[PDB]
Amino acid sequence: DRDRLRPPLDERSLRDQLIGAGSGWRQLDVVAQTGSTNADLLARAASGADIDGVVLIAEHQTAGRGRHGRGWAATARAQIILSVGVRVVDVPVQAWGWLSLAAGLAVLDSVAPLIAVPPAETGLKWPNDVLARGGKLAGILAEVAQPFVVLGVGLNVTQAPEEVDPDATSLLDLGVAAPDRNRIASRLLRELEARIIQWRNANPQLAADYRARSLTIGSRVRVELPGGQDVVGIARDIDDQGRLCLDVGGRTVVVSAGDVVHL
Numbered sequence: 001d002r003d004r005l006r007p008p009l010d011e012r013s014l015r016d017q018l019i020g021a022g023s024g025w026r027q028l029d030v031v032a033q034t035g036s037t038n039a040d041l042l043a044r045a046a047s048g049a050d051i052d053g054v055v056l057i058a059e060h061q062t063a064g065r066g067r068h069g070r071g072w073a074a075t076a077r078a079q080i081i082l083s084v085g086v087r088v089v090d091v092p093v094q095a096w097g098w099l100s101l102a103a104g105l106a107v108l109d110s111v112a113p114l115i116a117v118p119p120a121e122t123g124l125k126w127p128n129d130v131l132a133r134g135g136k137l138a139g140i141l142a143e144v145a146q147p148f149v150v151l152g153v154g155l156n157v158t159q160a161p162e163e164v165d166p167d168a169t170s171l172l173d174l175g176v177a178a179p180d181r182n183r184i185a186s187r188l189l190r191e192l193e194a195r196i197i198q199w200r201n202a203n204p205q206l207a208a209d210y211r212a213r214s215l216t217i218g219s220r221v222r223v224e225l226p227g228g229q230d231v232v233g234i235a236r237d238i239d240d241q242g243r244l245c246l247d248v249g250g251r252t253v254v255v256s257a258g259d260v261v262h263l
């Protein structure tokens with residue numbers, strides 16, 4: 001059973017590795033349990049905390065939140081569940097969508113080398129679902145608390161799909177025999193720091209790297225839009241606002257938000 005593969009995080013070691021000269025992370029806490037790490041960081045910002053470069057990791061999360069008012073499920077120590085704060089006020093608002101795409105890229109790049117063979121449908125589903133073998137390996141949620149965005153990552157490490165969602169997968173289920181969450185969390189946060197810096201500086205490599213890992217671009221898709229309408233087309237590109245560009249029988253439709261199904 002998977003619980004024998006879920007030792008606790010080592011908070012001291014993470015701080016040792018991630019906080020100090022050369023690193024932009026300013027604070028890191030591991031809590032045993034909370035409702036929602038995104039909610040917690042937002043609440044800190046709401047009461048005046050400077051949450052830029054602040055990391056909050058929860059071993060367990062009981063009232064997790066997904067995009068568009070959905071949920072996120074977890075069992076204790078089975079995921080890496082974290083939120084970070086990012087000051088965004090210095091960047092034009094039209095570019096903030098790319099911060100969420102950057103986070104997906106970082107999560108993917110941090111775990112991709114751990115999988116034995118790269119199986120089909122492994123990469124990013126727009127916006128930033130991390131997929132492996134067509135299963136959802138991580139979900140990312142970005143929320144605003146001016147002058148910040150809070151980025152939240154739920155990454156299935158040993159999480160069983162029946163525990164959370166039938167379309168989920170985990171590093172364990174992909175063949176990582178003994179995943180080390182301290183190693184993985186450190187890699188994730190180092191990748192994320194670089195991608196946040198690229199985003200802040202409008203580095204073209206961010207969009208290029210996102211395209212290189214996109215499962216959505218080039219695919220026939222059905223996109224379920226907020227408001228409950230569907231559009232079926234072929235995904236062609238992402239624009240400068242991080243929006244999905246669809247070819248719908250020769251007519252272009254640009255979507256800011258939606259649920260993508262690869263057909």
Ligand SMILES: Nc1ncnc2c1ncn2[C@H]1CNC[C@@H](COS(=O)(=O)NC(=O)CCCC[C@@H]2SC[C@@H]3NC(=O)N[C@@H]32)O1
Nearest residue numbers: 036037038064065066067073139140141152153154164168
């Ligand atoms: N562990 C699962 N694996 C894979 N699929 C799942 C799982 N738990 C439900 N799901 C499914 C169930 N249906 C809804 C769906 C929500 O998907 S969603 O709209 O694309 N949103 C997301 O994927 C964003 C999720 C962000 C979660 C992080 S955890 C740390 C932070 N704090 C917080 O409250 N939210 C963020 O997730």
